[PDB]
Design a protein around this ligand. Structure first.
Ligand SMILES: *[C@@H]1O[C@H](CO)[C@@H](O[C@@H]2O[C@H](CO)[C@@H](O)[C@H](O)[C@H]2NC(C)=O)[C@H](O)[C@H]1NC(C)=O
Ligand SMILES: *[C@@H]1O[C@H](CO)[C@@H](O[C@@H]2O[C@H](CO)[C@@H](O)[C@H](O)[C@H]2NC(C)=O)[C@H](O)[C@H]1NC(C)=O
Ligand SMILES: *[C@@H]1O[C@H](CO)[C@@H](O[C@@H]2O[C@H](CO)[C@@H](O)[C@H](O)[C@H]2NC(C)=O)[C@H](O)[C@H]1NC(C)=O
Ligand SMILES: *[C@@H]1O[C@H](CO)[C@@H](O[C@@H]2O[C@H](CO)[C@@H](O)[C@H](O)[C@H]2NC(C)=O)[C@H](O)[C@H]1NC(C)=O
Ligand SMILES: *[C@@H]1O[C@H](CO)[C@@H](O[C@@H]2O[C@H](CO)[C@@H](O)[C@H](O)[C@H]2NC(C)=O)[C@H](O)[C@H]1NC(C)=O
Ligand SMILES: *[C@@H]1O[C@H](CO)[C@@H](O[C@@H]2O[C@H](CO)[C@@H](O)[C@H](O)[C@H]2NC(C)=O)[C@H](O)[C@H]1NC(C)=O
Ligand SMILES: *[C@@H]1O[C@H](CO)[C@@H](O)[C@H](O)[C@H]1NC(C)=O
Ligand SMILES: *[C@@H]1O[C@H](CO)[C@@H](O)[C@H](O)[C@H]1NC(C)=O
Ligand SMILES: *[C@@H]1O[C@H](CO)[C@@H](O)[C@H](O)[C@H]1NC(C)=O
Ligand SMILES: *[C@@H]1O[C@H](CO)[C@@H](O)[C@H](O)[C@H]1NC(C)=O
Ligand SMILES: *[C@@H]1O[C@H](CO)[C@@H](O)[C@H](O)[C@H]1NC(C)=O
Ligand SMILES: *[C@@H]1O[C@H](CO)[C@@H](O)[C@H](O)[C@H]1NC(C)=O
Ligand SMILES: *[C@@H]1O[C@H](CO)[C@@H](O)[C@H](O)[C@H]1NC(C)=O
Ligand SMILES: *[C@@H]1O[C@H](CO)[C@@H](O)[C@H](O)[C@H]1NC(C)=O
Ligand SMILES: *[C@@H]1O[C@H](CO)[C@@H](O)[C@H](O)[C@H]1NC(C)=O
Ligand SMILES: [Mg+2]
Ligand SMILES: [Mg+2]
Ligand SMILES: [Mg+2]
Ligand SMILES: [Mg+2]
Ligand SMILES: [Mg+2]
Ligand SMILES: [Mg+2]
Ligand SMILES: [Mg+2]
Ligand SMILES: [Mg+2]
Ligand SMILES: [Mg+2]
Ligand SMILES: [Mg+2]
Ligand SMILES: [Mg+2]
Ligand SMILES: [Mg+2]
Lengths: 491, 491, 491
């Protein structure tokens, strides 16, 4: 008759890592790292993204004629611009403070376009003749639809004095522009005044623009240039224009009607016809994992991003092919014990089999489950990367922003990886200790009533029925009832 | 007669956390996290803060007339500005490079105001008539006291040529300004020259300002604007002004007399009449704790800021209501053992009581104390947040600065929390191991002379007096003297 | 006859630290921290650094006459500028966007200087008379060699219209400048036109400069100023100048011929005549260590920089002068056991000596080696600091960049230090556990055949020859063959 202490083994191949050993096979693991994505741009929680397919943000906001998909645009979840989209400023020039505007856009989900200075209301000043072949609409020359290019009416340009005063209670995005022509010939040909200005004044704005007349290498067919400016107008303020030439004038403005906090993603992808709660520039994520490795930029309810390739937690114990039990004086595990992690095996005149010591198994699974939840949550708060854009003379800042974004990504990846390494090692030792404590509980019930074999087994000197066995498993073993019989069986 | 191994228990309710178990009760803990603050603005190490109550920094430095608390200002420890203080630039306009000046101010504890270009010395140029109702002093119109608004004297404005050359050996903060009027009417009404300039030139400064004359939505009663500029003048340099109108001229300048490295705090609080060595925008800290959770911005000798809500270290052991002793084969602790952490209990014909195994207790308290000091100090060097201000077109930078400040705050909070979790678990196992080692020391002195009971106790076969007991506690137990008697008592 | 379990000890003094104990002596350690440097500026992987000894980058690029070491400059590995180098802009002025250009330079290893607008080709416009004593060449007045100071030819300055169109397929760095004179006298004395401009236009550039004529405190003998500008010209674009005075004109430009990604180091050092694979501003590094503490800025294949003063890993075990063996029931180590870490000592009628239990020793050294490699590599990816420069009105950004660089340096130093502390403690406990497991393997072979002494030793009841000893070391010990003899020897 003999009773044995041992542990669970199965046909698992799941491997884990520790500081001291790589590729150790465990009966049970738990992967915590999402590695796949649908590779599609999807609606975010129903709400469809504004995919400015070939248009740029500038070509959307000024109303490039090739951008007639976006003249009136529904509330979007996130915006998707290409890398080098074709339909940018079609008439050459620059957009002032472009990046700080894109930044404003990251925190806006709805514009309502409204007419503020109607095209007609220019009675002097021909306002239907500012038109260029650089900006063709269906074959014939055109211009940025939300702005009007004023030129001389009957060889005269009376100094303009106009004013708009914000209502709606919303904030209003207004845009305007100045023309830098190619030479004094065109200066007088178009506005006739040899030297002109534009004065824009709100409560917080005081500018005086003046056209830089110069010959320039022509791009897109044009040697002139168009400088554009923007501003946010408070719910009850006046914008107050004045100018005697070269004035590009606002016709339409944007109401900022809902500030719902989104992003501008750079992706070459097209819309994908899906919903998801988590989007990345290269695909969407459907996952309960606490971590992913898909892409640093996300939007939605998302896993924490880390740079690992595998992130697997041990939960079970070292699976047979620090303390003294597992793969120790107990050489291997019991394929035959399925109902628990640690337990007993008995042999006697009647029976032979396995009984898992539950409630020791159960204490183990509570500790492991707590461990895992504590890992999933202790990193609840990791660095979330955001997209920030910089122009060609902000290279220092852009580099600093890069080094910063990346330093945090590296730090959190180290943290996650090393936490999982250290806790895999502690978890395997925890199983080792639970098995050793069970063996040291069985030994000390039997003392001289059985021979301690050395391999986790106790050979009984007296004979031990299934009820005597179960008394040992119970922890209620009457040593004196077998004192006598065992004593005798000693020689 | 029986001797028992066991450990200390008390009536503590202090709880701690580990990775695997939450809310475990220990005989002794040590909280390391400050959670309270006096909620007052106090003198920092005696030195009283400059609380610009309703004034803004700009309204202090240019000398708004409503800011006549700060015309001559004593050395301050730290400065306290409100959020939207009423007494800013009372005559509308803007302050050039405002934030970079506030940044300079963060590293300055004393200004000495000195007159450099006295009001009188304008002999042409009426210098007592630049005055506005926008800036009222006690009912009647006034102006920024440290600067003088020059207007035409007898329908003439001779081009100004003035020069100041720094002495004192200190650095000097000089301020000036230009007026942008509302129309050409007021341009000639005040300076009479239809078109004017200001040229400011030091060794490192070469500027040409020109008034932007334009009609603007009037705020504070004024449709004109006042642009202000500043500069630091080296101890032996010349500032060298020239202008034919619209010149706001420096009368008083600041000597930077002591650069003692402080901050500008944003708080709505009023002075509190206290001293302290650590100040936050929402209250002061009196604490020996290594960490606090009061506020990220501090000044002084301060605890490290973390975002935790509780941060408690285990020092004692699991308190009764991995190795095999505590809450193991030894079911509970001894309320009756007060003089140590681990020890013995004996029963015999004479006595019954507890004796703490000191020097095992003492090795434990040295290890725990070292552990704690190493925790307190290994985080000696955490990220210290500073206040940085940005205007409405630096939103990208401000956001980057936010994400950065916060990423470090999150990383150090994770570090502290997880360090305390891991070391609480190791500390409890350390107590478990000390108890098991004591039991394995007592067993191996007695071998067959006593029956190993299973519950931390040894039932003696031979009889054992208080001196035999103390020989076992000592570690000097003569097995052969009782060989015989015990052998016999075996059956 | 007696067999004993024990462990290795030597005459090592190497100390390590753990969370609970400082200055513990181990048989074997491994320092992982480089602490020395040759204190020299060396060729980086053969490629010699451009050491602009007394010249500044500006004085190199515009061609200060005192900078005639750098008129034609070989491909460099890294650049070395002093702190306040004497030969900067010798004629006073400023260099526009200086820092963003230095930033461009950090990613460039070769310029090829080429003439684009030859000095002769000015036929009107005296182009050999722009010369100043501020910029002396060998006693007599001179000027920036790569740029030409055009002045009036025969009391006339016909408006300049020039154009260069990039070829070579490379990117081209072009430089130019404007003169701000001291008064209208010198304005007409030099260019004769009372009011002048410069218009620079590429595809992406549209500027109109205008000389600010003002009297200024003269430095270096000059009261005038020279503002310089730069730009990168795309491989097929036109730069297109026009101006009627005050024009400093490009003669030579730079081809960006190889973009090999380097740095600009600030050091007062001179070239040192050496090669190395790792350079710091204060010296070079020759080291296999994974970490160094020399300086944060490095270039090459370099160790990770941390701020520690010592970073030593335990590999061996606690060296004699948690589990129950080392410095426990086994009081000390065996100077006499050299061939392994753990082993046996035997005494009998024939022999007396030591036998290391190899393959237990070997399992230990595999685990320790893996531990160390995992430490060396898990921090493969640490923050690499880069040098970034800022001017006197970028103090906020510079401070943010400082706090950021430093926060990462502090975080990685904490990580390394605490990892080494925790793993030193685990490594010593790992040795403790290996010794205890060996003792618990020997005990359980012998059970009653030997008396368990208490000090790691087993006193045999039966007699045990070198072959019986080796059967115990083997793990193949026949208990029944000595059952009888030992039984008898019990009394
Ligand atoms: C234009 O902005 C002005 C302020 O410049 C607004 O003036 C207010 O108008 C309402 C009546 O419509 C009055 O109750 C307030 O007394 C006015 N405030 C001030 C300071 O005068 C005006 O409402 C705005 N008008 C439009 C069409 O936007
Ligand atoms: C502990 O284990 C034993 C049996 O494995 C249970 O003890 C009783 O044993 C006596 C004689 O040994 C029998 O007459 C009883 O019928 C057994 N009772 C039962 C309910 O099995 C004992 O109950 C176990 N303890 C617990 C809590 O289950
Ligand atoms: C004004 O700045 C000038 C330099 O522009 C200073 O000139 C020095 O004056 C002292 C005598 O007072 C002489 O010893 C030095 O030779 C002068 N240096 C130079 C370069 O000329 C002058 O001290 C300053 N004066 C004031 C009142 O501040
Ligand atoms: C170790 O413990 C014992 C007593 O608990 C001390 O040993 C001596 O015991 C003998 C007989 O057992 C007595 O005659 C002595 O008087 C005891 N001496 C003393 C000073 O108590 C022994 O001294 C203890 N060792 C130490 C260092 O205190
Ligand atoms: C100057 O830049 C122009 C474009 O402004 C280049 O023009 C091209 O020249 C080649 C022939 O030399 C032609 O094959 C292309 O058709 C031209 N492109 C265009 C848009 O016209 C020109 O090569 C450049 N010339 C120099 C000397 O750099
Ligand atoms: C295990 O250790 C023993 C000896 O230390 C080796 O066993 C044999 O012992 C018998 C009698 O005890 C001798 O007749 C043999 O000559 C021994 N054989 C050898 C090769 O030494 C035994 O071989 C050892 N096991 C291994 C794998 O080396
Ligand atoms: C196991 O071995 C090495 C790491 O030690 C690795 O190349 C390998 O991929 C790991 N196992 C499998 C099945 O990939
Ligand atoms: C203005 O237009 C009318 C016809 O509409 C014409 O009579 C007149 O001559 C024009 N004025 C000028 C300066 O050309
Ligand atoms: C994606 O997860 C969501 C649960 O939010 C659910 O719509 C769906 O079952 C998952 N898709 C697949 C293929 O499992
Ligand atoms: C103990 O239980 C939970 C955490 O498990 C928490 O809500 C509770 O506050 C903790 N105990 C006390 C006394 O607050
Ligand atoms: C200047 O003032 C005097 C009186 O002080 C007067 O005689 C003279 O006419 C004034 N000059 C002008 C242009 O008004
Ligand atoms: C605050 O701590 C300081 C010691 O620096 C001391 O003035 C004072 O005793 C403490 N205040 C209270 C209420 O304990
Ligand atoms: C050992 O003691 C302290 C740290 O506990 C330190 O001053 C000392 O330098 C360490 N040892 C040596 C040999 O330096
Ligand atoms: C131009 O130079 C020639 C001599 O080279 C001279 O005849 C002529 O007078 C000069 N023109 C002027 C305006 O000085
Ligand atoms: C420096 O290390 C390199 C190996 O890359 C080698 O040239 C040399 O042996 C080392 N120098 C010294 C003094 O050891
Ligand atoms: Mg088993
Ligand atoms: Mg198994
Ligand atoms: Mg696009
Ligand atoms: Mg066994
Ligand atoms: Mg107890
Ligand atoms: Mg207790
Ligand atoms: Mg205030
Ligand atoms: Mg017991
Ligand atoms: Mg030893
Ligand atoms: Mg040793
Ligand atoms: Mg130098
Ligand atoms: Mg022993």
């Amino acid at each position: 008759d003999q009773i044995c202490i041992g542990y669970h083994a199965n046909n698992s191949t799941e491997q884990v890592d520790t500081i001291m050993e790589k590729n150790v096979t465990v009966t049970h693991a738990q992967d915590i790292l999402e590695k796949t994505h649908n590779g599609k741009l999807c609606d975010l929680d129903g709400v469809k993204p504004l995919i400015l397919r070939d248009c740029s943000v500038a070509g959307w906001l000024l109303g490039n004629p090739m951008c007639d998909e976006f003249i009136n645009v529904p509330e979007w979840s996130y915006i998707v611009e290409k890398a080098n989209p074709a339909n940018d400023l079609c008439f050459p020039g620059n957009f002032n403070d472009y990046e700080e505007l894109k930044h404003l856009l990251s925190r806006i989900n709805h514009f309502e376009k409204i007419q503020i200075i109607p095209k007609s209301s220019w009675s002097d000043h021909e306002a239907s003749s500012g038109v260029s072949s650089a900006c063709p609409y269906q074959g014939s020359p055109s211009f940025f639809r939300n702005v009007v290019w004023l030129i001389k009416k009957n060889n005269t340009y009376p100094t303009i004095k106009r004013s708009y005063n914000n209502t709606n209670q919303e904030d209003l995005l207004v845009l305007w522009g100045i023309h830098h022509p190619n030479d004094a010939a065109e200066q007088t040909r178009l506005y006739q005044n040899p030297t002109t200005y534009i004065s824009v004044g709100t409560s917080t704005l005081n500018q005086r623009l003046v056209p830089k007349i110069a010959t320039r290498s022509k791009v897109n067919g044009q040697s002139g240039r168009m400088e554009f400016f923007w501003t946010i107008l408070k719910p009850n303020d006046a914008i107050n224009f004045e100018s005697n030439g070269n004035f590009i004038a606002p016709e339409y403005a944007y109401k900022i009607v809902k500030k719902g906090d989104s992003a501008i993603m750079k992706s070459e992808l097209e819309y994908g016809n899906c919903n998801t709660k988590c989007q990345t520039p290269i695909g969407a994520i459907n996952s309960s994992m606490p971590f992913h490795n898909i892409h640093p930029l996300t939007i939605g309810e998302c896993p924490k991003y880390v740079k690992s390739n595998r992130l697997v937690l041990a939960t079970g114990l070292r699976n047979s092919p620090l303390f003294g039990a597992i793969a120790g004086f107990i050489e291997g595990g019991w394929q035959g014990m399925v109902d628990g992690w640690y337990g007993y095996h008995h042999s006697n005149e009647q029976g032979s089999g396995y009984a898992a010591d539950k409630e020791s198994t159960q204490k183990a699974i509570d500790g492991v489950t707590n461990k895992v939840n504590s890992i999933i949550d202790k990193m609840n708060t990791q660095f979330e990367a955001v997209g920030r854009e910089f122009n060609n003379l902000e290279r220092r800042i852009e580099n600093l922003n890069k080094k910063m974004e990346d330093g945090f990504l590296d730090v959190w990846t180290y943290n996650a990886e090393l936490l999982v390494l250290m806790e895999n090692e502690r978890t395997l030792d925890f199983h080792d200790s639970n098995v050793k404590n069970l063996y040291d509980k069985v030994r000390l019930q039997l003392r001289d009533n059985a021979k301690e074999l050395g391999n986790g087994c106790f050979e009984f000197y007296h004979k031990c029925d299934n009820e005597c066995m179960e008394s040992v498993r119970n922890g209620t073993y009457d040593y004196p009832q077998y004192s006598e019989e065992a004593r005798l069986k000693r020689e």
